[PDB]
Amino acid sequence: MEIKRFGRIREVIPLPPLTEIQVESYRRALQADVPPEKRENVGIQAAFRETFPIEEGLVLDFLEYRLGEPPFPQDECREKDLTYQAPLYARLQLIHKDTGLIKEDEVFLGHIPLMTEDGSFIINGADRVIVSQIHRSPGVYFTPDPARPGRYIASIIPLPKRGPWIDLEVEPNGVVSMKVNKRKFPLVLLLRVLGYDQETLARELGAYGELVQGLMDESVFAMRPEEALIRLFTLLRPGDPPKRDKAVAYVYGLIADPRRYDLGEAGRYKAEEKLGIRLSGRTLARFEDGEFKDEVFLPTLRYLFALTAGVPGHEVDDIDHLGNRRIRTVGELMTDQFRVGLARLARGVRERMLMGSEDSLTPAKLVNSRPLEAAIREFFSRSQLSQFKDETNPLSSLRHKRRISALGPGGLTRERAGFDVRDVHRTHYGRICPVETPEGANIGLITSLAAYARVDELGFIRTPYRRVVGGVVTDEVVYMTATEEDRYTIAQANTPLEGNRIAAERVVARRKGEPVIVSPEEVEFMDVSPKQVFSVNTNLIPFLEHDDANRALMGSNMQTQAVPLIRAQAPVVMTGLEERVVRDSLAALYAEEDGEVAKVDGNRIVVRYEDGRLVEYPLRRFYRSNQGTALDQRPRVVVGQRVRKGDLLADGPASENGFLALGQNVLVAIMPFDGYNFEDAIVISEELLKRDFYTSIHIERYEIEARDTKLGPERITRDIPHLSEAALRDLDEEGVVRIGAEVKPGDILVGRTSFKGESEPTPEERLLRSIFGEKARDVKDTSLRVPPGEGGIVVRTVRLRRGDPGVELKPGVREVVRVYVAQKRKLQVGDKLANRHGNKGVVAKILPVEDMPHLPDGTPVDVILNPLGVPSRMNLGQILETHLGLAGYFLGQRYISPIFDGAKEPEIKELLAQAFEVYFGKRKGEGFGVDKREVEVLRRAEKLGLVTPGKTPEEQLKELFLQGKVVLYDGRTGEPIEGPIVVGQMFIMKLYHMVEDKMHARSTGPYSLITQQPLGGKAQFGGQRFGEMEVWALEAYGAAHTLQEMLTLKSDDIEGRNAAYEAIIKGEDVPEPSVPESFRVLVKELQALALDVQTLDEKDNPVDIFEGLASK
Amino acid sequence: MVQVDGGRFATSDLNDLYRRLINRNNRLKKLLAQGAPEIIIRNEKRMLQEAVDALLDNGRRGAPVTNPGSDRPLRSLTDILSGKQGRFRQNLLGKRVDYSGRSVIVVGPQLKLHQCGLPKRMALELFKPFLLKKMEEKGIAPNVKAARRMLERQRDIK
Amino acid sequence: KEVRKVRIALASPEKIRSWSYGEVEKPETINYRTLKPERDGLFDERIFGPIKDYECACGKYKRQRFEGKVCERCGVEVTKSIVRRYRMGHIELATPAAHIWFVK
Amino acid sequence: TGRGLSFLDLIQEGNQGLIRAVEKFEYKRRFKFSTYATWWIRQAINRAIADQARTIRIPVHMVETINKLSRTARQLQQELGREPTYEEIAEAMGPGWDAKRVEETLKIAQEPVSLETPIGDEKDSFYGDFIPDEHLPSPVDAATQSLLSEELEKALSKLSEREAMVLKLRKGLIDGREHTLEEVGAFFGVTRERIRQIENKALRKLKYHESRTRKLRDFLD
Amino acid sequence: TSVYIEDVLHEFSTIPGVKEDVVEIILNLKELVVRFLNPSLQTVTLLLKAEGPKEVKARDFLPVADVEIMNPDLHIATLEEGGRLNMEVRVDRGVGYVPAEKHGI
Amino acid sequence: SDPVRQYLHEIGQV
């Protein structure tokens, strides 16, 4: 079909590589493609250089490192539950200071995980995504004191866990105090330890009123640097012997040690820029020629005094400014953990270096790699930022990779974050999306990187603007930080241009975020596009300018939850971004060069390129995602087809001809339907099931292990006791279900027998054995069966065994078996649908086609949305999307309407006029006039003021059609809906929240160890929680007996629940309950605290709730 | 000290706190049996008192006791009683219960004010003992155990 | 008798020893080979009770007929295993220690 | 430090070693006290680490073996660029070590995990919360045992008093244990052959009633 | 109402040489119009056998007496060199809409 | 406050 595109804005630059924040950062951290001598002092190279050399005697220095090749490819890692990693070797040399003996060796330090092509990892077989972390950029800040108005706090902040925060304050007594490790002491002492004499401080700070006299203390200048040094060491180390080489060591490690204290390169730059100085390293002072030389303290104190006095050019700092908040990408986080592991390794190195042979020590005998290995393995497996990858659809993975968390190690603790961290700061324009963020506790703390935004080398987020010189908009694009952006008047990307010149006497622009009407002579820059303000998900919402931000948030977040359908369709109304999202997410498979397609298969595509080479592209077919959604590729070319470079060869999941296909284009009518779409519920047509719309494939993995036991081996077998041939029908000879079978709840997937315990048969057992004359078998059925409410078609069975080549399981495990069950889920009552504008709803009713409202030509609608969902939610975009979708239904075309610059109402009405001609002149030619019911609806519409009185039926029907409304017939009666109804095509997705996964119930089941209460969760066949507030409900009702049932007979009255089950199966009324076990647990846990809790009677005589079983 | 499905053991922190206590107590009894000087016995008694402290309310005084290779504080007896996860609020004033389930809700406009729509597969399990009894009352099964075995598999349900 | 009140009070050392079924002298939990509770340890069946209903540790008595009997070979009473949830032990300190609740 | 014991626990064990060294010193040898004291101090610290650093105590010789195994695997990985298999470790361990022995030694040295291990980022889930209790019988188990005892009494009442009592005494439904033919015969006052004959005929009548009514088959699983 | 394909165990499969997966092949077969001429006829088992480079359409079904295919241009599969397709499809008389989960034929 | 500090202080007396 034709794709008519709206919009007048020209996109000077395309969207950057969307996962570059991941791939580029990890590349820079590893430097694996860089020969060792050319490496920069960044990343793990910088970690090595920081740790080494290791001294004290012997010396172990570091030459270089190298990363070998992965021992296994990515798919094999995914199957064998391995980690995609590369071996890490480091060439180290040992030197004896006296002997001069130099021994050299390449030591192996374990493995480091490698980032896949799309910017994700594989940790123990599970795809993971390291989420970038936003935090306060290191540097020197000046903030207003909350208590004292005219006073200000000077804060000095290094990288997280790379030095202590320092505070400088003008106390109420006049002296200038410094706070370090929560110790307030006069700064004059440290200034004296730096070698500052009263001469220099008086000539440097005297200009600022009487403030310098707060720095004048005679008892401090009376002593030389060493005495003041020991004085400060005593003030900072109560009890520690103030030795000279101890005080020097502590002060160096606290203020000048580059291996302990470290501003970032960003902190270095920001200190230099703020204080108007230049720094040598990344610390606050130095140890030069034996004495301490100041770097930062005097400039900071000077700026603080100038801010307190009122000297012009000194202002406080906005700590929410995106020029003072920076991002820590995957590389920086992994490097910090690498540095921690290396420090532990160095501690072990020195340990082995003090007591060894002093001659028979090689680098191998000195390096235990384990402390490093763990420090990496802990980061990728148990960090707050090492998140389980969300690959529901390709867009979900891309969005996950582009996230920004204020949480994590070194981040905000939740329940402690205020409004400021969560606010949309003005500097978020173009850098951080103001829409995509979770609703709930994490609001404003998890955010998304804007579409055109880039993180620079220092960590600050930069956004692009076009240069404008003398009213002429160039094509030179400058990427600015927020601090840089605040210098210029920046016009809006929609200002009218006559081709390269600003063609408006008054243009809308920003000055430090403030909106302002300026002249083209004042414009210094211009925006690139509206797209640069919002994230990728938000950018996929057509008519975004018509939706309130609160529902735009939901429509944005819910595309992440769209399930790949077997017949997925791209939206009839797109934003012009549906292609880049498929391409950058590595969803589809494209052509590497120009050439001719040689072979096309269901599993592979072979292409002959202009170089004569025959390149084979395998197709990933029916693979299971982290969320169970099917990720399969399908060939979209055919044999003999000529293809150019970058042409589509295979559609991935949720991709239609290279366009993002997260749902279906359905025909919606917007009207109530007999209460079946009450309160956001949705009514759908059975036709949607008949043509397999909203049908998705889902695969589940089941796993079992046979291990060695103290009581005999577990063996995976078909020889399961007490089972019929009907129970073992679909089991193969080895006991594993056969590929192709249909498994329902209760069916066996893998047979397993386990030896029983002592199992001393109670006399009933012995007598039953004798009566039936059958020996009690030595093993019992512990087979893996299909859980309740699950099942499908077996598609794979994997079996690994001890003694098989290439296989080695964890100790004790004889064998592992995995079974993959695939199911084709149709839409059912209770499944959740949504559109892109925040309209979400659960399918409440599936009517047969004959009951559906239908057009006069007999076409039934697909979905019935309730109009009451629109006004309160203010998301009129979906309305416009419907109107346009109506035109494209009869013209047979889709559309591209970019956000904030797209289809306007008059153009939609032009298209609607053409559509009405296609829709009605057909009927007028086929020999039919206007219908009687149409005449009645037209009378009603005339009453409503929707059509002009006096025109012909065709004219009024065309007027309605231009308003997007049509006559609609009630399928149950044939009479028309009394008014004309909005009908049109809408893009609707099936979210991941399907009732098939959530319906759960339980009579009785497993109970907890200590509490003897039901377990929680569907997977554990658990019971619902009756919490404090449900108890309050029952109390407020007066349901004393129902509540007592909840507290005793149904949860943890052991005798009570057993007796209740027996009474119910016997037809008897349930017994009165007894003491719940958790109160006995409370009594015993209080006794363990030396507290005697005594249940008494009304005579104050003890009552034994333990029935004598605990009294000697 | 329970054995998980994988054959490995999982245990409560109170065991490690008690082991700390018992080791320090026994070392004190032995240091007193011999003629240990003042400094050593004083250090031992201080460590014993702090062991009792970690057992009864860990983290209350001083740095909280952790396990090797972890920053997580060990869960003492005060932590077991106090908080949203303590014994009172988590297990005594509210419990997880049997004969209970949950599912997605959907409007039913045909219901009368006193009715709801309950899926068959939910109500079967929720009312399962009643269903076994009534199945025995009719001819559907010989006894309760046979009725339960008949309901075990979905294909065996008529 | 019906429960009507619940008193709570401080427990004396004599009261605590009244509760206890035996002093825990060793820091051991279970044997690394047999996976059975060690002697005088934190899980000793001699102190806290039998792991299996009406069955002593060694196995000389394994039926309900013996009830309250204490095996002479291993020292484990023959009662319900449920009592391992109810039977306190104790630890005799070489030096008294303050109850931190009443200190901090 | 780091090897399983607190700094102060290590210090106190070293002090115990220092006491031993004091009581074992000999000043005639002209050696300073530190030289002889360091030996006993190291000995006491290492013995303490071996004896106390494991919730499931492992004898000191087995701890030595497990440490030797760890160091062998570490050297093998330092020379192989990957973690060794069981067979390579068995090679490098010498005679008597096969792969199965390495596997058993690694299995026997597995330390337990905390039931209070956190599950999730919210502070509302423990690893122990998902471990079902296997010891205490379920309501279904107790009800099935009760119905089994009731059906057994229903089947035993169809016998005469003597043969029902003979079966109850021979299987333990009376006083727990199972009696011998001589005991039941001296209790009923007949020959052990006669008590065995009436036990046989009781079992035969029970088999006949069970083939007729089938009221006890489902309990046999 | 049912489809068997040689060397195909279940619906989530591919066939070498065939571009369409089995899911798409069954979706195509769902559009097959089959007219019965005999009134008392209830079930017909169409047999299809194809190979080589060809676009297997609905005509390629071996003809059965008193059975006509009303949409013979209906695409079925796109076989390449060496791709073989051997199907047995089953057409029944019926009324209304009956999903596969309810008849399991 | 810090038992290691306290012990290292008591040790520095002898």
Add this chain to the structure above:
DNA sequence: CATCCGTGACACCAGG
């Protein structure tokens, strides 16, 4: 009769 400080507490279900 003030300020300073140590210690409490900070929604529910679901799945984790």
Add this chain to the structure above:
DNA sequence: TATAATGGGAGCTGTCACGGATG
């Protein structure tokens, strides 16, 4: 069992109200 060896080392960065201590 014996050369001599003699004081550690992280820490890493809420928000409020309340009752008790101090100053």
